[PDB]
Each structure stands twice: as C-alpha cells, then as structure tokens.
Amino acid sequence: AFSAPAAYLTHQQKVLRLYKRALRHLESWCVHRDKYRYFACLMRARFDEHKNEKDMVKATQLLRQAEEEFWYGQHPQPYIFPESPGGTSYERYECYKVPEWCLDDWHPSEKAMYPDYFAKREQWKRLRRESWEREVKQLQEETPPGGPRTEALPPARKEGDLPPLWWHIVTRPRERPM
Amino acid sequence: NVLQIVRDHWVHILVPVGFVFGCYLDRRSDEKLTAFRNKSLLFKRELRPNEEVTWK
Amino acid sequence: STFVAYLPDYRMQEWARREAERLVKYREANGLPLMESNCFDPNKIQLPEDED
Amino acid sequence: KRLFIIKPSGFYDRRFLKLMRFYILLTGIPVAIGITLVNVFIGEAELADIPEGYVPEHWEYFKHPISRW
Amino acid sequence: MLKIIIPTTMLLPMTWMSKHNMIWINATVHSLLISLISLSLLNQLGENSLNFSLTFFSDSLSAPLLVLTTWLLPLMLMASQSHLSKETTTRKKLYITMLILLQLFLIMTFTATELILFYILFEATLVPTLIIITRWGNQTERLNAGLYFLFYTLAGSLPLLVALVYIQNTTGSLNFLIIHYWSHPLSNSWSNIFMWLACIMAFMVKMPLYGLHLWLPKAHVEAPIAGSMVLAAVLLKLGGYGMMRITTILNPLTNYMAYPFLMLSMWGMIMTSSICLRQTDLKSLIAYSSVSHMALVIVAIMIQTPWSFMGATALMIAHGLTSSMLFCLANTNYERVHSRTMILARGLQTLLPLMATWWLVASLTNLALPPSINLIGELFIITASFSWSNITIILMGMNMMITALYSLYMLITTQRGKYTHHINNIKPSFTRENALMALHILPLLLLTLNPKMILGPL
Amino acid sequence: PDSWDKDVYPEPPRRTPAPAPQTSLPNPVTYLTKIFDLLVDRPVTLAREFIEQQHAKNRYYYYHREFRRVPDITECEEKDILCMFEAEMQWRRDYKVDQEIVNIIQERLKACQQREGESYRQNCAKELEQFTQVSKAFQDRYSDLGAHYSARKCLAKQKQRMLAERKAAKEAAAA
Amino acid sequence: SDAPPLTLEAIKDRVLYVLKLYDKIDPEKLSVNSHFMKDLGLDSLDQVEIIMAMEDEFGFEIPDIDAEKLMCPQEIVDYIADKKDVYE
Ligand SMILES: CCCCCCCCCCCCCCCCCC(=O)OC[C@H](COP(=O)([O-])OCC(O)COP(=O)([O-])OC[C@@H](COC(=O)CCCCCCCCCCCCCCCCC)OC(=O)CCCCCCCCCCCCCCCCC)OC(=O)CCCCCCCCCCCCCCCCC
Ligand SMILES: CCCCCCCCCCCCCCCCC[C@@H](O)O[C@H](CO[C@H](O)CCCCCCCCCCCCCCC)COP(=O)(O)OCC[N+](C)(C)C
Ligand SMILES: CCCCCCCCCCCCCCCCC[C@@H](O)O[C@H](CO[C@H](O)CCCCCCCCCCCCCCC)COP(=O)(O)OCC[N+](C)(C)C
Ligand SMILES: CCCCCCCCCCCC(=O)SCCNC(=O)CCNC(=O)[C@H](O)C(C)(C)COP(=O)(O)O
C-alpha cells in the first residue's frame, strides 16, 4: 500500500507470495497450533527441496504445478484479518474520516473554541504554502525528459526542503478518526 | 419622512388590491346569474316577512 | 393546515350517514328489504311493446 | 489524551433547525391554545329538530364552532 | 375565481416596478399569499362542481392541481435566485415574468369551462416554458431540447383542435357540463376511431406515453431548475387532467381502443424503470422515474373505474411534489460541483448530513413507502388493474421491485461510500436550500394526514 | 350510550358471569384494577365533569338538513337540461345514502364476528345474510357503471335487466 | 475501555520478544539494527516467516510489496507505528 509497484514481479517474488498464501491457507485448514506447526514444517521442507534448481524453465514449471495444486486445494473460507480487504471490519471506520479542508468552512463561533489548535493549523498551512514551489521545482529537475517511469517520489535533499507531494500523505485523517 | 418609505414600498398594495378587485368582480358575476333564484324545485321557499332575496 | 382541517362538511358525509340511519331504522321496523335492486320505480318506465 | 475530532461544520444545520422550529412554534402554539380554549369553553353544537316555521342559516347545519365560523 | 387570477396579474407590474434588490422578496411573499388564498378552493361538494361563472369552474379534480401550482411558484423563485445572481436586473425581471405568466396560464387552464378555451390556454403554456429552457439553460443541447419539446407537443395537439371544432359542429357546444349531461355513445366506425385518436394523442404525448417520451429527458435535463420543477410537477399533469375530462365522450370505444396504450404503458413502465438502473446522469434518472409514474397514471385513466381515477389523482399530486424535490436535491450538488455525473461526488453524507436526511426522505417517498400518498395512489391503481385482469399484478409487481432498487441505488451512489478526495469545494448547506427541501416535504406528510383532499371527484 | 340508535346498531343483552374464587391467594388483577380506578378513572372523570359543566353553560344547536323529492330521470324530457340537473343531483344523493347503508351493514357484520369469538361461524348467520342481500341489491343498482357514471346509465342498466327478466319469464311461461 | 494506546517502546519490545523466540536467531547477537540477511544470515523464506509472525503478534496483515522490504527490527517497528498512527 505504501511502496510503489514495479512493472512486473520476479520469479523469486512469485515463489515467496505463493509460499505465504499456501502457509496461510494451510493454517486455515489446520486450526490447532501444533498441527499447523507440523504441516508448516513439512511445507517448508517441500518448498526448499527444489531450491537449488539451476534450470529456470523447470523452476517455472514447478511453480505452475504448485499454483494449480494450490487452487485445487485452497480453503473456500480462509481466515482473513478483520481489517484486511476481505475482513469483517475492512472499511468500518471510513464514514468517520473527514478531510481537513472542511475545517476551513467552520463558523467563527465554532473556531472560537480550540484557538491553539487553529493557530497550529495556520502554521502548517503557511509551511505548505512556502514549500509548494520548491517541491514543484525539484520534481521538474529530477524527472527524466520522457516523463516518469515509476511512481516513486524523491526525498528532500536541500537545506530546509520538504519531500515533494507530502501534504495529503502527512495529513491523513486517522485509522480511528472519531 | 414617509415619502421615501412610500416610494420604496408602494408595490406592496398591488396584490391585496387585486384580491379585493377580484372579489368584487366575482360578486358582480354572481349578480348576473339570478334567473333561477328561489325557483328550483329543491330549494323553492316562501320568503320571510322581512328578507327580499334568498341569496345575493 | 388548520383551515383545511376544520373545513365544514360540504361533502355531506354526516348527512348521508344520518339519512342512511333513518332509512335502515324504518325498513327494519316495517320488515321491508333494506335495499331494492331497482333504483327507479317500474311504473314510471315504459318498456318496448314487443320483444320478438 | 484528548484529540481533536475533524467534522464538517454543524453550525448551519443547527441554525436552520432552530429557525424552523421557532417559526413553526411561534404560529402553532397560539393556534393550539386557541383550539383548546374554544373546545373547553365553546363546545360542539347539539343536534336538534328544526322548530316549526324556522329557516336555519347555512352555517347552522354544522356542529363544530370553528367549522361553523 | 378572479380573486386568484387578478393577484397574479398584479404580481406582474409589482415585479416590474420593484426596486432592483427587492424583486425576490416581494415575489416570494406575494406568491405565498396567493397560495394561501387559493387554499380555499379545497371546500368542495359531493354532487356537483363550484360553477363560479359562465367561464370558470372548480372541481374536486382541479382544486388540488391549482393549489400545487400556486405553491410551486414560490419554491421555483427560491430555487432560481442562486444561479441568477450574476444576471442583470431586466433579465431577472423577465425570468420572473415568464414564471408568473406560466402560473397564470396554468390557473386558467385548470378551471376553463369550455374545451376550446382549455385548448388555447394549454397551448399558451408552451411559450414561457420554451423561452425559459432555450434562454436560461446552461448547455448547448438546450436548443435541441426546445425543439423536441415544441413539435412533439404540437404534432399531438393540432389534430385535437380539429376534432374539437368538429365536435362543436355536431353537438353545438363544448361546455363541459353540457357535454357531460348530453353524452351519447360512440359507434364502432373508422371515423369514430380516428376521432378517438385525435382526442387522445395530444394528452398521450403530454403524459408522456412510452414511445412518445423522448422529448422529456432532453427538456427536463437541459432546463434550468425552475423549468424542471414546473415541467415535472404540473405540466405533465395537463395530459392526465385533459384525458380524464375528455374520456366522458369516448365510450364505449375506449373499451377496446385502450389496448395498445395499456400494453405500451405497462411494458414501458417496466422498461423505463430498468433504464433508471443504468444511468450516468442524475437528472435523467429522475426524468425516467417521472415517465414510469406517468405510465401508471395512464393505465389508471384508461381502465376507467372510480378506484383508478382516485389513484390517478393521488399519484399525480404525490409525484409532482416528490419529483420537484428530487430535482432540487440534484441541483444542490450540481451547483456545488458543476457536473451532473452521478459518481463524481460520492460520500456526501459525511460532508452534508441534513441534506442526506432530505435525500433519504425524498427517495423513500419515490419508492412509495406506506402510508405516503404516493403509495395510496399506487395501491389504488394496482387494485383497479387487478380487477381489470388478475395477470397485471405480475407487471405492476415487477415495477415495485425495480423502482425501490434504482431509488436506493441513487441514494447509495451519492450519500454513502467514501468522499471523492480531490473535491474540496463542498460548502455547508445554506438555509435557503434546507428551507426549500422542508417546504417540499412537509406538505406531503400533511396530505397523508388527510388524504380525501387529493382523491378527486370520484 | 345514547349517542347512537340501538336499533340501527343492535347488541345482545351482555351476559357476564360473577366471580367465583376458588383459591385463598389474592387476585393481582383485582388489586391492579382498584389502583387503576383510584389513580386514573377518577381524575379523568373530574376533568370530564368540569368540561361538561362548562359546555352546559353554552348550549347551542345544529340541524339535519332536509331535502324534498324532485322528479326522477324517468320523468325528464330528452333535452330538458334543468330537470335532468335536478334529477342527477337527487340520484347522486341517493347513491351516497345507499353507500352509507352498506357501510352500516358491514359494521354490524364485523362487530358480530369480533363479539361471538370462537362461535362466529354459527352466531353471525343473520348478519351475513343481511349483508348478502344488501350487497346483491347494491351490485344490481350500481356495479359496472364505470367512471363517468350518471342517472341515465343507471336507468339504461335497469331497463336492460328488466328486458332480460321479462324475456326469461315469458320463455319459462311457455314451458 | 478499549485497548491501551500502543507506544513505540511497546511495539519495539513485542517485535524483539517475537524475534528472540525464533530458534534461528541468537538472542544475545540480536539488536534492533541487525540485518536479517547480512547480520543474522537468514534467507527469504525465513523473512516471510518472520513477517507472518509479526502479523500474528499484532493482529493485522502486511501486504507483500511492503513486507518484502523490511530487513531489520527497526523497519518493522517503524512500519507498524506508521500503520497504527503511533507518534509517541
Ligand atoms: C415541532 C416543530 C418541528 C417541525 C415538525 C413539523 C410540524 C408541522 C406542523 C404543520 C401544522 C399542523 C396543523 C394541523 C392542524 C390539526 C389540528 C386538529 O385538527 O386537532 C385535532 C385534535 C382536536 O380535535 P377537535 O375536533 O378540535 O376536538 C373535538 C372536541 O370538541 C374536543 O373534545 P373536548 O370537548 O373533550 O376538548 C378537549 C380539550 C380538553 O381536553 C382535556 O382537557 C382532557 C384531556 C385529558 C385530561 C384528563 C386527566 C388529566 C387531569 C386530571 C388532574 C386534574 C383534575 C383534578 C385536579 C386535582 C388533581 C388530582 O383538548 C383539546 O381541545 C384538544 C387539544 C388541542 C390540540 C390542537 C392541535 C393544534 C396544533 C397546531 C400547531 C402545529 C404545530 C405543533 C405545535 C403545537 C404546540 C406543541 O387534536 C388532537 O391532536 C387530539 C389528539 C389526542 C388524542 C389522544 C391520542 C390517541 C392515541 C391513539 C393512537 C395510539 C397509537 C400510538 C401513537 C400515539 C402517538 C400520538
Ligand atoms: C423537527 C422535529 C420533528 C419531530 C418532532 C415533532 C413533535 C410532535 C409533532 C408531530 C405531530 C404528529 C401528527 C399526529 C396527527 C395529529 C393531528 C390530526 O389529528 O389532525 C388531522 C388534521 O390534519 C389536517 O386535516 C391535514 C393538513 C392539511 C394539509 C394541507 C397543507 C397546507 C398547504 C401547503 C401547500 C400545498 C401543497 C400540496 C398541494 C396539493 C386529523 O384530521 P380529521 O380526522 O379530519 O379531524 C377530525 C375533527 N375535525 C374535523 C373537527 C378537525
Ligand atoms: C410509438 C407509439 C405511438 C403511440 C401509439 C398509438 C396506438 C395506435 C394503434 C391503433 C389501435 C387500433 C386502431 C383501429 C382498431 C382496430 C384496428 C384493426 O387492426 O382491427 C381490425 C381491422 O381489420 C383489419 O385489420 C383492417 C385494418 C388494416 C389496415 C390498418 C393498418 C395497420 C398496419 C400497421 C401500421 C402502423 C400504424 C402506426 C404508425 C406509427 C378489426 O377488424 P374490423 O371489425 O373489420 O375493424 C373494426 C372497425 N370497423 C368496425 C369499422 C370495421
Ligand atoms: C492449502 C494447500 C495448497 C498448497 C499446495 C502448494 C504446493 C506447492 C509446493 C511445492 C512448490 C515448490 O516447491 S516450487 C520450486 C521452485 N524452485 C525454484 O524456483 C528454484 C530457484 N530458486 C529460487 O528461485 C529461490 O531460491 C527461492 C526458492 C525463491 C527462495 O528465495 P530466496 O532464497 O532468495 O529467499
């Protein structure tokens, strides 16, 4: 969610992702801890049995067969962490998330409460206004002529710079806003 | 000082005056359809010792 | 809303209910049928002479 | 610790609701009081036979005082 | 009934003599007063109509329509003054003049005693609507919309005119009371069939009937907000009122001339409800909703029973209020984001809670939640159709399932989910918009409290 | 009470059994109903007595409106608009009164069904028969006139039924 | 009430606690800056198992693209703190 994706996944990445998926589904099948540990050690042995195959074609064939076996033997109802995309609390608190710009529309009577908070907010807004043009200039310099090729962004490099395009990442609402 | 107030808010009598004039014209229209007043078989009635017409 | 709620009964619902009450009382007292299938008296109707 | 909770401005909706309640009540509390006072101290008419030779006014054919008025 | 007509004609010079910054206040105040005066027409009899003069009369069918018209004028004024702020004083006065002239024409149309006077006023309503659409609409399509609005109407109404004058040469009168008392049956001949079609098609295209409805999405989408309000709430009901008036001379031909129109109405009600499920423009969805409800009204008028007539009257009133409210609700979002695409602005319940409550209530009345008068009209029509044929409950039933779906779909798309991140210009709701929503919705429930006022002469 | 006529809305003599306690335990229902009496029924009775005292000091009357009988649609010439108008108004009033008669009979039926409890199928036979007769008469008079009904269409329907009945009677006579 | 307000020190303590219960890592030789591959001599499968153990410890899932990059306990602690809005 945080890292910029690459153009493709490598063979090692696919093997590791299959290993994690297989272990998770095996834990879903093996509810008890000791049984899961036993069969997970067996699965790890089965995985590292073919770790030293120098023929890449045979390696991809083995990966293909393993993925077919996984799809046949997957748990139809695997365990999902409650806040994971399939969980029971996945987007539960999205209705409580309010963007910060709404605070600009508060009536002055509402802003009369919380004076110090709004003074700090004004300081942050001043910082963003002072940093924007330098961020844009740094992005203009660091970008190759044929446009960017990845979604990775550079850090700040100068004396008192800020990493470009930082406002909406830094001022995230919260994970439990209200 | 009522001069400025009148010249600013004299448009507020047009609609009430129109309502009154419409009521008057409706009464005038009713005045022209009395050919069967106190003459229907259902409502024909003897006049009271004082009243002249059954309705206006 | 108050003006509409207190509008006088020009639809004659209560009048019709009272008239029906009187009619039912009279007809049940004298043993007549409550309602007749004919709403017009046949003696005031002249049917065509021949049906053949 | 106590944290600031970011919400949209609730001032304007509350103001509208208060204004609507105020005006509705401003005209509807006198109406309710008047209806109650009329009902208590000027009841409904009692149905009676028409006396011989009397021609009632049209508003005399209804029973509630407000409807008659 | 000049006590209602003359004050509107007085609204005209009152608007044209007002100070430049008092036009809206004066127009709104005196429009509300005129609505209060027109409230007295609801005192109706059980036997005949209120015959004011040789020219005007009031029935139990036209009085709620007049009340709806006079109540809709101030709401239109309130909804229009936001997007007309940059306009010049003369053009604002001209816009208000168009609205006033439309109200006057509608008021005289609903109370005319003769059919030719009714026809003249019912065509005269065309000019202010067309001017409003083509002069104050926002996009380039408005011009095309105007053309679609005009000719679709006139191609229906020009035959009717001919039929009308023909009838006056045969019976000697077009007075509605004389026409009703001296009614004679229509024989089964080709001439009578074409007379029936000439008498029916103008009102059919006004409803509109499915297959003749293409003008409506264009005109109701391209119009300004007041234009859409008056097009959905009142101008569609001209067809139903005219059909219920004109059917008194078409028996017993209707007994079999209604079949193609009944089939079109039922199947096209299903079709337009289905179309509402895949719509990217929020205004077009509301327009197709209007088409489905009017198909129900057409079925009710065509089967010609007392229960169907009561249901048709109730449904017309309820739909007018509900569709006007829905158009205003969509216009608030459009004025905020300047786009009619439904999925552009999402999660608006988080940003505007009271407006979300208004959305919920409007969508609840659209799907005819009991005991709303929407549901009362729909249920009366469905019961009458069941008496007409037991199989209709299938199609009607399907409609009831689809309507709710798309209705809730609309709500779920606009109010729920997460807000769009890049839209940062959503300001809090103004007092004017909340008052507009309340003045739409409160009369609906108040009418539920006393439903016999919108059930018609039957 | 005396608010309604007891012959138009009759009720049985209301036989109810006397309490027959068989247990030494007290009856919570009796204790609760005594509390309800003393705590609810008395203040309401006093308020009603005050309201009725106020009402008695201002006694005024309203009257039931009387309509005389005008000629029916059968006695009207073909194009005589005034007689047709009066006859049509009289016919509409009669239609409303007939609807209210049916309503009274249906009220009787519903009340009997609720009153008789588990024995309603046998104990409501008379009300069911009365409703059957009234419904048949009303259906003969007014059904199928449609919207845009009038006295003339009702007369045409009655004439058609009379013609059919006369033909059936004469054909049965020839048997 | 609900769970206590997780702090950075608690997160680091639990991460180190999980790591010292792993039989392939020497407890004394382990520090908060030790690299899994260079310092500790583990391969990619061990890193996947470590990430899964962290997920079990803290009751939430770390996506694969983010989990591949974590190489020392400090990165794991920082990722968990950033995810859960921990600032103290
Ligand atoms: C909040 C705003 C926010 C926005 C919201 C939107 C708002 C929109 C509003 C739009 C405008 C709306 C206007 C509509 C106009 C309609 C007015 C109307 O027609 O009134 C009708 C009706 C009056 O009818 P009426 O024809 O005038 O009366 C005929 C008779 O002549 C009368 O009989 P009477 O001779 O017996 O006299 C009775 C008299 C006196 O009766 C009594 O005194 C007796 C009562 C019992 C007392 C007995 C015991 C108590 C005392 C004992 C102790 C003291 C005595 C001993 C002292 C010592 C103590 C021990 O009382 C009355 O007169 C009736 C009350 C008057 C109410 C009028 C309503 C007007 C409202 C208009 C304003 C609208 C806005 C609202 C604002 C209003 C202010 C809040 O008013 C009522 O509403 C009555 C309802 C109460 C009946 C009981 C309820 C039964 C429940 C059954 C259902 C159960 C299901 C559960 C649901 C329950 C939920 C309720
Ligand atoms: C924001 C907070 C909301 C919640 C809080 C609310 C607090 C409580 C308030 C809610 C009240 C609950 C309503 C319960 C009903 C009680 C009132 C009821 O009994 O009165 C009805 C009366 O209601 C009215 O009749 C209906 C109102 C009329 C509607 C017209 C609206 C005004 C015009 C506006 C523009 C028109 C646009 C639509 C065009 C068609 C009954 O009529 P009726 O049974 O006979 O009375 C018999 C005795 N009479 C005849 C002597 C009076
Ligand atoms: C897109 C939607 C537009 C709006 C929809 C409007 C619907 C209009 C449809 C008209 C309904 C019926 C019209 C006439 C009634 C019967 C028509 C005919 O088909 O029935 C038979 C008629 O018989 C034959 O069909 C002769 C007619 C055949 C010629 C008509 C052309 C129809 C072909 C389809 C053309 C499409 C027309 C619509 C264009 C848009 C009945 O036999 P018959 O008893 O003897 O005729 C009754 C009349 N009599 C008694 C005087 C003799
Ligand atoms: C729920 C039940 C369904 C599950 C069934 C699953 C069945 C599959 C079991 C067998 C699958 C295999 O072994 S597939 C065998 C695949 N073998 C190869 O690719 C050889 C080349 N080696 C490498 O790529 C790296 O060493 C690598 C291995 C990635 C380690 O990565 P690191 O060292 O850099 O961390």
UniProtKB/TrEMBL annotation, chain A:
Family: Belongs to the complex I LYR family.
Keywords linked to the UniProt accession: Acetylation, Electron transport, Membrane, Mitochondrion, Mitochondrion inner membrane, Phosphoprotein, Respiratory chain, Transport
Region (Disordered): 135-164
Membrane-related topology note: Peripheral membrane protein
Residue ranges occupied by any Complex 1 LYR protein domain in the UniProt entry: 13-71
Places the protein is found: Mitochondrion inner membrane
Subunit description: Mammalian complex I is composed of 45 different subunits.
Main location: mitochondrion
Any Pfam family: Complex1_LYR
Gene Ontology cellular component annotations, sorted alphabetically: mitochondrial inner membrane
Protein name: NADH dehydrogenase [ubiquinone] 1 beta subcomplex subunit 9
Coiled coil start-end: none
Function: Accessory subunit of the mitochondrial membrane respiratory chain NADH dehydrogenase (Complex I), that is believed to be not involved in catalysis. Complex I functions in the transfer of electrons from NADH to the respiratory chain. The immediate electron acceptor for the enzyme is believed to be ubiquinone.
Any Gene Ontology biological process: mitochondrial electron transport, NADH to ubiquinone
From TrEMBL, chain C:
Organism, scientific name: Sus scrofa
Superkingdom field: Eukaryota
Stated family: Belongs to the complex I NDUFB11 subunit family.
Localization terms from the record: Mitochondrion inner membrane
Function: Accessory subunit of the mitochondrial membrane respiratory chain NADH dehydrogenase (Complex I), that is believed not to be involved in catalysis. Complex I functions in the transfer of electrons from NADH to the respiratory chain. The immediate electron acceptor for the enzyme is believed to be ubiquinone.
This protein's name: NADH dehydrogenase [ubiquinone] 1 beta subcomplex subunit 11, mitochondrial
Subunit structure: Complex I is composed of 45 different subunits. Interacts with BCAP31.
UniProtKB/TrEMBL annotation, chain E:
UniProt key word Mitochondrion: yes
Main location: mitochondrion
Any single Gene Ontology cellular-component annotation: mitochondrial membrane
Location of this chain's protein in the cell: Mitochondrion membrane
Keyword field: Electron transport, Membrane, Mitochondrion, NAD, Respiratory chain, Translocase, Transmembrane, Transmembrane helix, Transport, Ubiquinone
Pfam families named in the record: Oxidored_q5_N, Proton_antipo_M
All copies of domain NADH:quinone oxidoreductase/Mrp antiporter transmembrane, residue ranges: 112-401
One Gene Ontology term from the biological process aspect of the record: ATP synthesis coupled electron transport
Catalytic activity: a ubiquinone + NADH + 5 H(+)(in) = a ubiquinol + NAD(+) + 4 H(+)(out)
Keyword Transferase appears in the UniProt entry: no
Membrane-spanning parts: 21-41, 61-80, 92-110, 116-133, 145-167, 193-216, 223-244, 256-277, 284-303, 309-330, 351-369, 389-412, 433-449
An example molecular function term from Gene Ontology annotations: NADH dehydrogenase (ubiquinone) activity
Entry membrane topology: Multi-pass membrane protein
E.C. no: 7.1.1.2
Domain NADH:ubiquinone oxidoreductase chain 4 N-terminal: 1-109
InterPro entries: NADH4_N (IPR000260), NADH_Q_OxRdtase_chainM/4 (IPR010227), NADH_UbQ_OxRdtase (IPR003918), ND/Mrp_TM (IPR001750)
Family designation: Belongs to the complex I subunit 4 family.
Described purpose of this protein according to its UniProt entry: Core subunit of the mitochondrial membrane respiratory chain NADH dehydrogenase (Complex I) which catalyzes electron transfer from NADH through the respiratory chain, using ubiquinone as an electron acceptor. Essential for the catalytic activity and assembly of complex I.
Complex formation: Core subunit of respiratory chain NADH dehydrogenase (Complex I) which is composed of 45 different subunits.
PANTHER family named in the record: NADH-UBIQUINONE OXIDOREDUCTASE CHAIN 4
Protein name listed in UniProt: NADH-ubiquinone oxidoreductase chain 4
From TrEMBL, chain G:
Swiss-Prot/TrEMBL GO biological process terms: fatty acid biosynthetic process
GO CC entries: mitochondrial membrane; respiratory chain complex I
Statement: the UniProt record of this protein carries the keyword Lipid biosynthesis: yes
Record's keyword annotation contains Ribosomal protein: no
Top-rank taxon, per record: Eukaryota
Subcellular location: Mitochondrion
UniProt keyword annotations, A-Z: Electron transport, Fatty acid biosynthesis, Fatty acid metabolism, Lipid biosynthesis, Lipid metabolism, Mitochondrion, Phosphopantetheine, Phosphoprotein, Respiratory chain, Transit peptide, Transport, Ubiquinone
Family, similarity comment: Belongs to the acyl carrier protein (ACP) family.
Function: Carrier of the growing fatty acid chain in fatty acid biosynthesis.
Protein name: Acyl carrier protein
Residues included from the entire protein: 69 to 156 of 156
